[PDB]
Design a binder for this molecule. Structure first.
Ligand SMILES: *CC(=O)Nc1ccc(-c2nc3ccc(C)cn3c2Nc2c(C)cccc2Cl)cc1
Ligand SMILES: *CC(=O)Nc1ccc(-c2nc3ccc(C)cn3c2Nc2c(C)cccc2Cl)cc1
Ligand SMILES: [Ca+2]
Ligand SMILES: [Ca+2]
Ligand SMILES: [Ca+2]
Ligand SMILES: [Ca+2]
Ligand SMILES: [Ca+2]
Ligand SMILES: [Ca+2]
Lengths: 236, 5, 236, 5
């Protein structure tokens, strides 16, 4: 594409610079270019891809929520008519958000997931697939919402099955996947009991395996465990 | 909003 | 342009929404569209234009500073060669920054300043002209740096002459202009004594006029006076 | 950096 003439290594180098400068749209474009070179991504490179898109879509989501709240208020009794502008602008932001999600899902489908054989890479990519279908689900209102939800669920479930068979219960990828799938259950699938059960079981099984870890691994795992606990506290 | 990573 | 088919009032409405959603690139594009309708801007509308571009260029400047610092470190003794990428990416960011400054200066020249007759509007626009030439000066390194600096100086000076004749010493526009021109002197023109003198004289003349103000006007003026004091404390 | 508005 636009990055077709730049070396893969230069793309990675500039993604790292963009991260330092908090230029996440540029970071995402550089990492998209790197993926489109066709080679598999290292662990570090996967992390750069995920950070860039997480920050781009995270800003979009926050803006969409602001605009949706204004639009909801505009449709309450006693609200004065202000015309089509709030809906139009929410729609603009939504369409941009959907386009970013479609871009990431496209990279995963062409061809990151099919070439990912090791458990750690495959689980990482399937978690991303679940996440970006989840973001699509957050804004979905039509005859495809059910199918979008099912696409998220299916990706997360495949990732969960792999992680349980192939990774220890303290593995950060495994833990982060569970955290996010539990949020899926609570916020998207209208399954708060499933969300709570998953968070609890994940936390407890990780706790029992902490004794096997180095100091630095212990720090990583306990940080994510605290996020599970924070959600449990919010929900109970 | 709940925590995700 | 791209906004040619949207009503002026709808552009203003969406700029306000974009502000609430912290979508400052969208806000800037909406206000550019509004200016290009050809009508003069109200006080509120001028403020929307300035906020949008300030936030866009402010992010660019922060990213440019990060990248410039990395580039400077790359050219120290004992630094390993890493290739052209740091310079190329700093150049990309710089070119984008210059393009935003050129866009704003273009709006001021076509035709906001020439149609601005009231002191408050003319001073506001000339302050912006000084500011965006100042941002150009921050990144200028070639045979035009002197001319860019002189363009900033000239705009600020015209604004200062008007403000002194036509506005009270507590007027927020007058105060903010002085604050920024004093920074110009310190950071751009290598004139720290001029910067300090201007900040001090501005502060003292405002203090002597506070007695004339309402509670709400007093609050506005004293807030900006505190910024003058903060700079004086930094510089002395 | 110094304050500007
Ligand atoms: C290649 C690879 O293993 N990538 C990877 C591993 C672990 C993380 C990660 N580690 C931590 C530790 C603490 C916290 C609060 C979060 N955290 C993450 N975040 C994360 C990400 C960004 C993606 C998927 C799972 C996790 Cl846990 C990051 C990347
Ligand atoms: C139309 C018009 O008068 N615009 C206008 C007036 C005043 C301000 C302004 N008021 C304050 C009060 C306190 C502080 C800390 C800052 N401040 C501003 N900022 C400002 C701006 C954004 C532009 C030019 C001068 C000033 Cl002072 C804003 C807009
Ligand atoms: Ca190559
Ligand atoms: Ca719109
Ligand atoms: Ca493979
Ligand atoms: Ca019209
Ligand atoms: Ca570049
Ligand atoms: Ca006029």
């Amino acid at each position: 594409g636009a990055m077709g003439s730049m070396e893969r290594a230069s793309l990675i180098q500039k993604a790292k610079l963009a991260e330092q400068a908090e230029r996440y749209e540029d970071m995402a474009a550089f990492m998209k270019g790197a993926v489109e070179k066709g080679e598999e991504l290292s662990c570090e490179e996967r992390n750069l891809l995920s950070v860039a898109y997480k920050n781009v879509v995270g800003g979009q989501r926050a803006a969409w929520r602001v605009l949706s709240s204004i639009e909801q208020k505009s449709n309450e009794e006693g609200s004065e008519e202000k015309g089509p502008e709030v809906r139009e602008y929410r729609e603009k932001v939504e369409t941009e958000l959907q386009g970013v999600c479609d871009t990431v899902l496209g990279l995963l489908d062409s061809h990151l997931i099919k070439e990912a054989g090791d458990a750690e890479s495959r689980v990482f990519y399937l978690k991303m697939k679940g996440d970006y279908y989840r973001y699509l689900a957050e804004v979905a209102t039509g005859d495809d919402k059910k199918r979008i939800i099912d696409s998220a669920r299916s990706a997360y479930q495949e990732a969960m099955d792999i992680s349980k068979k192939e990774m220890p219960p303290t593995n950060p990828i495994r833990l982060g996947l569970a955290l996010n799938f539990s949020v899926f259950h609570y916020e998207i699938a209208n399954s708060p009991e499933e969300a709570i059960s998953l968070a609890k079981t994940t936390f407890d099984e990780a706790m029992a395996d902490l004794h096997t870890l180095s100091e630095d691994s212990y720090k990583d795992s306990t940080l994510i465990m605290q996020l599970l606990r924070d959600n449990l506290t919010l929900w109970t | 909003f709940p925590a995700t990573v």
